[PDB]
Design a protein around this ligand. Structure first.
Ligand SMILES: C[S@@+](CC[C@H](N)C(=O)[O-])C[C@H]1O[C@@H](n2cnc3c(N)ncnc32)[C@H](O)[C@@H]1O
Length: 360
């Protein structure tokens, strides 16, 4: 956009509708064209760093719940000959810089994340703060606006431009009851309470894919085993409780997922903390090959799952095992067989299948 060269993480080609930026980003930017910018500049959910690159000279803070976004942003900064140091990266749960002058928000996929972010902004914005949100027009719902009025203040909206649309907010500090950071629920059949940060997968209750997976999890495992894409950590917890001698690596792209996992171990079995590693990563990038005895994965429901499978194969030991839950209809059996040479169906739901591939 605007003479910047920008690439998605995993880079895509020219006919892939998925690109590094969308109209919404440019529309947002254009709101500031006739503006003298006063930092701090906060940028939320900047997916591949388009806004961060555009506004680097102002030394923006890029806030979000995605390490992939940070990686992508650093790459794009480099492709544009901009210093990495120009952009400061913050997790969504962190304390935001006080008295920001400009807050740009890409509306996130989930209402819950948006609300936690607006409550976090509520602590730092003033009525002088220029607050603007942008997204595909179709992603701007009445509920979105309502959220804004509830937490920050009165909203104005713009016309559509290339399927994108924006919201302007003027901070009112409206009357608001405080709300918890996490949503908790009891894991059936357990003494465990599972806490879930705003952006965590299936945060309101146990995922049925995971419920099916937990029944056919491998036991009597040693060495290190991976909860690859851990989310709230439930699989990891179950592995710790099932494999007394193993250490468990909780891995997720989302710092909120990792935080949730850490919290759930600290909360439901602190005596096991000595055997846990909590890693924020893009799958297993930069991880030593031949390190693990087992990897367990409930891939997002794709290029992604295949990336995970490959990482799994690479970092597994010989005879190490990858276990997966997947929707029954995807051809994951054959992708696994291709990647590993083998594959075995452990179990199958009405909707889910648990697969197993050995590293050869
Ligand atoms: C379907 S959820 C599985 C959650 C939990 N392990 C379970 O079984 O219920 C998939 C998780 O993978 C994470 N994820 C997506 N892409 C990733 C990536 N490239 N690297 C690491 N984790 C990723 C997502 O944040 C999400 O938490």
């Amino acid at each position: 956009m605007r003479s910047l060269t920008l690439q998605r993480f995993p880079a895509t080609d020219d006919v892939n509708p998925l690109q590094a930026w969308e109209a919404a980003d440019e529309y947002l930017l254009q709101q500031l064209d006739d503006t003298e910018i006063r930092g701090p500049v906060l940028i939320l959910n900047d997916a591949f760093g388009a806004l961060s690159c555009a506004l680097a000279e102002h030394k923006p803070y890029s806030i979000g719940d995605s390490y992939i976004s940070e990686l992508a942003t650093r790459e794009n900064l480099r492709l544009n000959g901009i210093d990495e140091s120009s952009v400061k990266f913050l997790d969504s749960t962190a304390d935001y810089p006080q008295q920001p002058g400009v807050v740009l928000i890409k509306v996130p996929k989930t209402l819950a994340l948006l609300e936690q972010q607006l409550r976090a902004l509520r602590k730092v914005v003033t009525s002088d703060t220029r607050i603007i949100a942008g997204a595909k027009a179709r992603d701007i719902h009445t509920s979105t606006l309502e959220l804004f009025e509830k937490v920050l203040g009165p909203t104005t909206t713009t016309l559509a431009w290339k399927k994108a649309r924006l919201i302007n907010c003027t901070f009112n500090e409206p009357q608001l009851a405080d709300a918890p950071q996490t949503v908790s629920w009891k894991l059936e059949g357990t003494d465990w309470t599972i806490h879930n940060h705003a952006n965590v997968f299936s945060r309101t209750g146990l995922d049925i894919g995971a419920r099916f997976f937990m029944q056919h999890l491998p036991e009597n495992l040693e060495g290190e085993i991976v909860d690859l894409g851990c989310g709230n950590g439930v699989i990891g917890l179950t592995l710790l409780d099932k494999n007394p001698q193993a250490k468990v690596v909780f891995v997720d792209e989302s710092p909120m997922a990792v935080a949730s996992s850490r919290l759930n171990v600290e909360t439901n079995m602190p005596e096991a903390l000595d055997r846990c590693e909590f890693m924020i990563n893009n799958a297993l990038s930069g991880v030593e090959p031949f390190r693990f005895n087992a990897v367990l994965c409930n891939p997002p429901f794709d290029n992604v799952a295949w990336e995970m499978f490959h990482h799994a194969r690479r970092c597994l030991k010989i005879n190490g095992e990858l276990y997966i839950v997947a929707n029954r209809h995807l051809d994951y059996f054959h992708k696994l067989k291709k990647i590993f040479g083998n594959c075995t169906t452990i179990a199958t739901n009405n909707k889910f299948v648990v697969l197993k591939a050995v590293k050869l």
